[PDB]
Amino acid sequence: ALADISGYLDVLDSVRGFSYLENAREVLRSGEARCLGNPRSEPEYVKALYVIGASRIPVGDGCSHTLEELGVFDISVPGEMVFPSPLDFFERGKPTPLVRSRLQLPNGVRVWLKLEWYNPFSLSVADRPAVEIISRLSRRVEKGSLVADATSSNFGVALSAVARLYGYRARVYLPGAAEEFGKLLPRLLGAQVIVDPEAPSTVHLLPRVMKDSKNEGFVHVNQYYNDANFEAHMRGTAREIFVQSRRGGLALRGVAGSLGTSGHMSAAAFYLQSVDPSIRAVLVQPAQGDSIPGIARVETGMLWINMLDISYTLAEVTLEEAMEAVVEVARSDGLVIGPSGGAAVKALAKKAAEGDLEPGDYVVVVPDTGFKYLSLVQNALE
Numbered sequence: 001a002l003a004d005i006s007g008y009l010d011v012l013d014s015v016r017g018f019s020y021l022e023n024a025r026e027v028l029r030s031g032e033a034r035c036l037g038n039p040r041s042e043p044e045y046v047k048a049l050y051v052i053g054a055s056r057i058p059v060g061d062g063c064s065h066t067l068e069e070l071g072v073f074d075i076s077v078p079g080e081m082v083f084p085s086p087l088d089f090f091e092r093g094k095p096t097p098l099v100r101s102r103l104q105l106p107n108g109v110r111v112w113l114k115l116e117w118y119n120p121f122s123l124s125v126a127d128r129p130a131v132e133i134i135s136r137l138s139r140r141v142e143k144g145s146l147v148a149d150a151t152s153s154n155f156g157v158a159l160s161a162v163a164r165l166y167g168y169r170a171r172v173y174l175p176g177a178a179e180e181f182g183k184l185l186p187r188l189l190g191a192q193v194i195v196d197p198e199a200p201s202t203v204h205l206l207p208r209v210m211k212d213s214k215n216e217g218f219v220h221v222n223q224y225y226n227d228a229n230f231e232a233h234m235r236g237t238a239r240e241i242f243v244q245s246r247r248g249g250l251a252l253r254g255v256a257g258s259l260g261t262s263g264h265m266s267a268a269a270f271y272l273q274s275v276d277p278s279i280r281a282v283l284v285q286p287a288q289g290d291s292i293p294g295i296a297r298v299e300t301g302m303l304w305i306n307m308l309d310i311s312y313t314l315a316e317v318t319l320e321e322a323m324e325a326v327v328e329v330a331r332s333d334g335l336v337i338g339p340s341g342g343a344a345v346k347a348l349a350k351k352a353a354e355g356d357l358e359p360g361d362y363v364v365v366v367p368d369t370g371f372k373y374l375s376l377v378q379n380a381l382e
């Protein structure tokens with residue numbers, strides 16, 4: 001028997017840890033789930049179902065239900081694209097587009113681009129964790145409380161818009177080296193913004209944010225460590241790649257992406273590799289000395305990409321190389337991607353060149369629009 005998952009979403013405030021993901025893998029890999037006689041005695045199972053994008057839960061004595069029955073494959077989007085509010089637009093106006101590129105890689109490696117700038121608040125993938133985190137927050141923390149974090153830019157914008165849509169106040173802390181959209185836009189959206197000229201990276205701002213949190217009593221929402229960030233991309237970004245691939249007729253052989261907190265590619269890889277363990281995750285390691293905005297090297301500390309049981313390969317990519325690739329996707333497809341998108345295109349293009357990859361369809365996740373990166377555009381032309 002099928003019941004609504006919404007009623008049972010207190011498990012989000014009660015399950016901790018990662019042992020619950022064993023349930024996900026089996027349900028995904030099997031393509032079904034066992035009915036629970038007492039949904040409340042199985043909090044691990046129930047959470048797993050939500051995290052894979054189920055909308056309903058299987059309830060009763062001895063039965064099972066498929067992914068389709070559970071609502072993993074439910075179409076959310078109104079065909080007419082009419083939405084009664086922006087937050088409902090983020091939620092229901094999904095998936096983000098999967099576009100097959102005219103870009104041609106060797107060895108029958110077909111490039112598809114998942115355009116995460118089709119998120120309404122930050123025009124970037126960071127919307128998805130921002131809505132998930134703040135939505136759980138709305139359960140506990142009283143309205144008018146100040147919520148805050150460090151960001152390279154996107155999340156700070158996403159946090160500021162979404163905070164204020166939930167009655168919360170926002171503060172964002174940014175490195176001096178972040179772009180002007182990051183420093184400026186949260187202010188337009190009603191946040192405070194703090195820029196540390198001496199912080200060379202977003203991770204290095206973390207102690208300052210924790211220190212001030214202890215002093216002032218704001219809720220440091222902590223995108224690096226907040227399990228909602230991984231979970232949002234499990235039921236959103238990754239699930240979409242699962243569903244789109246299948247509805248698309250794709251022979252999905254891998255994913256390619258970039259790492260900041262590591263939330264989105266950990267989710268894609270884990271979810272996809274639950275379904276089919278051979279699926280490669282090709283991940284970018286920005287080259288040493290170089291800065292690619294929004295992303296970083298793994299060894300600077302990332303929660304999920306280490307701890308979860310995820311097969312991935314790395315490819316080294318310089319800024320200059322991420323910028324070359326922006327330029328060529330612009331000339332191939334007329335679509336203007338961000339630095340970190342080009343980095344992932346490049347990264348896959350190398351594994352493809354090397355002979356390391358099967359022929360078939362790969363999905364790259366493109367985190368944002370290149371329209372926010374005029375300097376790096378300018379410098380890559382001259």
Ligand SMILES: Cc1ncc(COP(=O)(O)O)c(/C=N/[C@@H](CS)C(=O)O)c1O
Binds near residue numbers: 156202260264338
């Ligand atoms: C342009 C762009 N590309 C990739 C990512 C990497 O995504 P995750 O690995 O975080 O899912 C991000 C996330 N950026 C975080 C900074 S670590 C933020 O906006 O504060 C980004 O903004």
